[PDB]
Write an enzyme that holds these catalytic residues in place. Structure first.
Site, short mmCIF file in Angstrom:
data_model
loop_
_atom_site.label_atom_id
_atom_site.label_comp_id
_atom_site.label_asym_id
_atom_site.label_seq_id
_atom_site.Cartn_x
_atom_site.Cartn_y
_atom_site.Cartn_z
N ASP A 154 1.43 -0.63 -2.45
CA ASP A 154 0.79 -0.93 -3.75
C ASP A 154 0.83 0.24 -4.76
O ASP A 154 -0.12 0.44 -5.53
CB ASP A 154 -0.66 -1.42 -3.54
CG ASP A 154 -0.73 -2.87 -3.06
OD1 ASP A 154 0.29 -3.41 -2.59
OD2 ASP A 154 -1.82 -3.48 -3.15
N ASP A 175 5.02 -4.06 -1.44
CA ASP A 175 4.54 -4.55 -2.73
C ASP A 175 4.30 -3.41 -3.71
O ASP A 175 3.26 -3.35 -4.36
CB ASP A 175 3.24 -5.38 -2.55
CG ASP A 175 3.42 -6.59 -1.64
OD1 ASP A 175 4.55 -6.89 -1.24
OD2 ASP A 175 2.40 -7.25 -1.32
N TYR A 206 8.61 -4.54 0.52
CA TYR A 206 9.01 -5.43 -0.58
C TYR A 206 8.84 -4.64 -1.87
O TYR A 206 7.78 -4.05 -2.11
CB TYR A 206 8.14 -6.70 -0.62
CG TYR A 206 7.86 -7.27 0.76
CD1 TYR A 206 6.77 -6.83 1.51
CD2 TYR A 206 8.71 -8.22 1.33
CE1 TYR A 206 6.52 -7.33 2.78
CE2 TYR A 206 8.47 -8.73 2.61
CZ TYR A 206 7.36 -8.27 3.32
OH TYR A 206 7.09 -8.74 4.59
C1 LIG Z 1 -10.46 -7.49 -12.81
O1 LIG Z 1 -9.67 -7.71 -11.64
C2 LIG Z 1 -9.89 -8.89 -10.82
O2 LIG Z 1 -9.70 -10.00 -11.30
C3 LIG Z 1 -10.32 -8.73 -9.39
O3 LIG Z 1 -10.13 -7.37 -8.99
C4 LIG Z 1 -10.43 -7.12 -7.61
O4 LIG Z 1 -9.38 -7.75 -6.85
C5 LIG Z 1 -8.01 -7.48 -6.53
C6 LIG Z 1 -7.18 -8.77 -6.51
O5 LIG Z 1 -7.26 -9.45 -7.78
C7 LIG Z 1 -7.63 -9.70 -5.38
O6 LIG Z 1 -6.73 -10.80 -5.27
C8 LIG Z 1 -7.65 -8.96 -4.04
O7 LIG Z 1 -6.33 -8.60 -3.61
C9 LIG Z 1 -6.06 -8.35 -2.22
C10 LIG Z 1 -5.53 -6.94 -2.01
O8 LIG Z 1 -6.47 -5.95 -2.47
C11 LIG Z 1 -4.19 -6.76 -2.71
O9 LIG Z 1 -3.67 -5.46 -2.43
C12 LIG Z 1 -3.21 -7.84 -2.23
O10 LIG Z 1 -2.92 -7.64 -0.83
C13 LIG Z 1 -1.73 -8.19 -0.26
C14 LIG Z 1 -2.09 -9.10 0.91
O11 LIG Z 1 -2.93 -10.18 0.48
C15 LIG Z 1 -2.80 -8.29 2.00
O12 LIG Z 1 -3.03 -9.09 3.17
C16 LIG Z 1 -1.96 -7.08 2.39
O13 LIG Z 1 -0.75 -7.43 3.09
C17 LIG Z 1 -0.57 -7.43 4.51
C18 LIG Z 1 -0.24 -6.02 5.02
O14 LIG Z 1 -1.21 -5.09 4.53
C19 LIG Z 1 1.16 -5.59 4.60
O15 LIG Z 1 1.51 -4.40 5.32
C20 LIG Z 1 2.18 -6.68 4.92
O16 LIG Z 1 2.54 -6.76 6.32
C21 LIG Z 1 3.60 -6.75 7.29
C22 LIG Z 1 4.27 -8.12 7.35
O17 LIG Z 1 4.65 -8.55 6.04
C23 LIG Z 1 3.32 -9.14 8.00
O18 LIG Z 1 3.97 -10.41 8.12
C24 LIG Z 1 2.85 -8.64 9.37
O19 LIG Z 1 3.93 -8.64 10.32
O20 LIG Z 1 2.27 -7.33 9.27
C25 LIG Z 1 3.09 -6.31 8.67
C26 LIG Z 1 2.31 -5.03 8.56
O21 LIG Z 1 2.94 -3.94 8.63
O22 LIG Z 1 1.07 -5.08 8.40
O23 LIG Z 1 1.79 -7.92 4.33
C27 LIG Z 1 0.55 -8.42 4.84
C28 LIG Z 1 0.25 -9.76 4.23
O24 LIG Z 1 1.16 -10.36 3.62
O25 LIG Z 1 -0.90 -10.23 4.34
O26 LIG Z 1 -1.62 -6.31 1.23
C29 LIG Z 1 -0.86 -7.04 0.25
C30 LIG Z 1 -0.44 -6.07 -0.83
O27 LIG Z 1 -0.55 -4.86 -0.56
O28 LIG Z 1 0.00 -6.48 -1.94
O29 LIG Z 1 -3.76 -9.16 -2.38
C31 LIG Z 1 -5.03 -9.37 -1.73
C32 LIG Z 1 -5.51 -10.77 -1.98
O30 LIG Z 1 -6.60 -11.12 -1.46
O31 LIG Z 1 -4.81 -11.53 -2.68
O32 LIG Z 1 -8.43 -7.76 -4.16
C33 LIG Z 1 -7.96 -6.83 -5.14
C34 LIG Z 1 -8.80 -5.58 -5.08
O33 LIG Z 1 -8.72 -4.75 -6.01
O34 LIG Z 1 -9.54 -5.42 -4.09
C35 LIG Z 1 -11.89 -7.48 -7.29
O35 LIG Z 1 -12.11 -7.38 -5.88
C36 LIG Z 1 -12.21 -8.90 -7.76
O36 LIG Z 1 -13.61 -9.16 -7.60
C37 LIG Z 1 -11.80 -9.10 -9.22
O37 LIG Z 1 -12.60 -8.26 -10.06
#
Ligand SMILES: COC(=O)[C@H]1O[C@H](O[C@@H]2[C@H](O)[C@@H](O)[C@@H](O[C@@H]3[C@H](O)[C@@H](O)[C@@H](O[C@@H]4[C@H](O)[C@@H](O)[C@@H](O[C@@H]5[C@H](O)[C@@H](O)[C@@H](O[C@@H]6[C@H](O)[C@@H](O)[C@@H](O)O[C@@H]6C(=O)O)O[C@@H]5C(=O)O)O[C@@H]4C(=O)O)O[C@@H]3C(=O)O)O[C@@H]2C(=O)O)[C@H](O)[C@@H](O)[C@H]1O
Length: 342
Positions: A154, A175, A206
């Site tokens: 990220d 990502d 990615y």
């Molecule tokens: C004003 O702003 C707003 O509107 C909000 O802000 C805050 O929220 C944001 C965001 O809007 C919200 O959706 C939420 O986002 C989280 C997360 O913080 C974000 O980084 C992203 O994460 C994705 C994914 O969903 C995660 O599961 C994770 O990915 C995992 C793993 O970490 C990664 O390594 C990978 O994995 C490999 C393989 O691909 C996998 O198949 C397996 O074999 O494991 C491997 C491994 O090595 O681990 O992918 C995994 C996966 O696909 O799940 O990380 C990704 C990423 O980095 O992009 O999206 C999530 C989400 O829930 O959608 O939270 C954000 C935040 O800032 O916290 C406020 O909280 C909100 O209230 C609001 O104000």
């Protein structure tokens, strides 16, 4: 004619200079007149939130002027709560008409050291996102020229309005360019990093994870750039060009993956090494709490005249026509905004 409103330096021998970047930024008069800060070579261990419009940072050199802090999403605050992904950012841009030039911005969260920790180690973080630069919804018209962005998971979070990255370096793993912003990249090196923690045959990362709303014309647009591996140890076919991020979002009927965040990533005239395998899918949680998969074929993922060993053309990698490619000029992507430096 170019002049500086404030100067930051590590040395007291410089004279009338600020010790920290935060202090120099705070020193700016309230309002929206241009304010330009020169940052002399040095590593500044600072986290910054930019809320003043028309603020401009210029480093002495990209190689030598560094703004860095170590913060993961899973890093705990004083109250014991997590910073979260947005909260992890070294620099947060929440103002209009910001520019940075000739400097490096890092998140120094040691992802590999974290992954190497024993599973029972209570200090081993699961929420490993660690943002270097975050352009927020209140960011529009943010310009980064000759800037290096460093992280793993990220690295660059582009939300809200328009941002332009030129002559840049961006490194990361999973990502590392993500979000719903209109972000144009020209003549950039996008550097896919080695994953010591990933088994042979599994995906290392990615480049992009766009969450572009379906009604938004442009998402992530990469032009005249180089998609490169950090080292020869980065395996062939280990990196995806993009996967579709549908952010967990609060709706009237609950909190779940946004169905309308159908991301766009377009590559034009960009070199790709053979670490690239193509596009990929991504999972989220639906309105019922079930796993839902979002597929690249349902997303706005395109290439135009890619070259280098990673540039294969197949049905799984859709190509723009010449006419379609003409829609992705700087003028069209950025609209009425012409990025300029002070
Ligand atoms: C004003 O702003 C707003 O509107 C909000 O802000 C805050 O929220 C944001 C965001 O809007 C919200 O959706 C939420 O986002 C989280 C997360 O913080 C974000 O980084 C992203 O994460 C994705 C994914 O969903 C995660 O599961 C994770 O990915 C995992 C793993 O970490 C990664 O390594 C990978 O994995 C490999 C393989 O691909 C996998 O198949 C397996 O074999 O494991 C491997 C491994 O090595 O681990 O992918 C995994 C996966 O696909 O799940 O990380 C990704 C990423 O980095 O992009 O999206 C999530 C989400 O829930 O959608 O939270 C954000 C935040 O800032 O916290 C406020 O909280 C909100 O209230 C609001 O104000």
């Amino acid at each position: 004619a170019t002049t500086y409103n404030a100067v930051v330096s590590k040395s007291s021998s410089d004279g009338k200079t600020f010790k920290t970047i935060a202090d120099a930024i705070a020193s700016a008069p309230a309002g929206s007149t241009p304010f330009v800060i020169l940052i002399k070579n040095g590593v500044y261990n600072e986290r910054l939130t930019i809320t003043r419009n028309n603020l401009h940072l210029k480093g002495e050199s990209r190689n030598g002027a560094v703004i860095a802090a170590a913060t993961a999403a899973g890093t705990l605050k004083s109250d014991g709560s997590k910073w979260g992904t947005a909260g992890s950012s070294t620099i947060t841009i929440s103002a209009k008409d910001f520019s940075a030039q000739s400097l490096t911005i890092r998140n120094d969260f040691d992802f590999p050291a974290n992954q190497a920790k024993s599973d029972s180690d209570s200090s081993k973080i699961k929420d490993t996102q660690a943002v270097a630069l975050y352009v927020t919804k209140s960011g529009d018209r943010a310009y980064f020229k000759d800037v290096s962005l460093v992280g793993y998971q990220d690295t660059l979070y582009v939300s809200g309005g328009r941002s332009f990255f030129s002559d840049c370096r961006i490194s990361g793993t999973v990502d590392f360019i993500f979000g719903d912003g209109t972000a144009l990249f020209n003549n950039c090196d996008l550097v896919s990093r080695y994953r010591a923690d990933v088994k042979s045959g599994n995906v290392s990362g990615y480049l992009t994870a766009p969450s572009t709303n379906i009604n938004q014309k442009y998402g992530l647009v990469i032009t005249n750039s180089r998609v490169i591996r950090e080292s020869d140890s980065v395996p062939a076919k280990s990196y995806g060009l993009g996967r579709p991020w549908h952010p967990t979002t609060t709706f009237s009927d609950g909190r779940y993956a946004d169905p309308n965040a159908i991301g766009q990533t377009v590559f034009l005239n960009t070199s790709m090494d053979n670490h690239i395998y193509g596009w990929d899918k991504m999972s989220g949680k639906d309105k019922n709490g079930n796993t839902i998969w979002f597929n690249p074929e349902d997303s706005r993922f395109f290439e135009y005249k890619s070259y280098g060993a990673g540039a294969t053309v197949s049905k799984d990698r859709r190509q723009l026509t010449d006419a379609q490619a003409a829609e992705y000029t700087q003028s069209k992507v950025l609209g009425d905004w012409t990025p300029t430096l002070p």
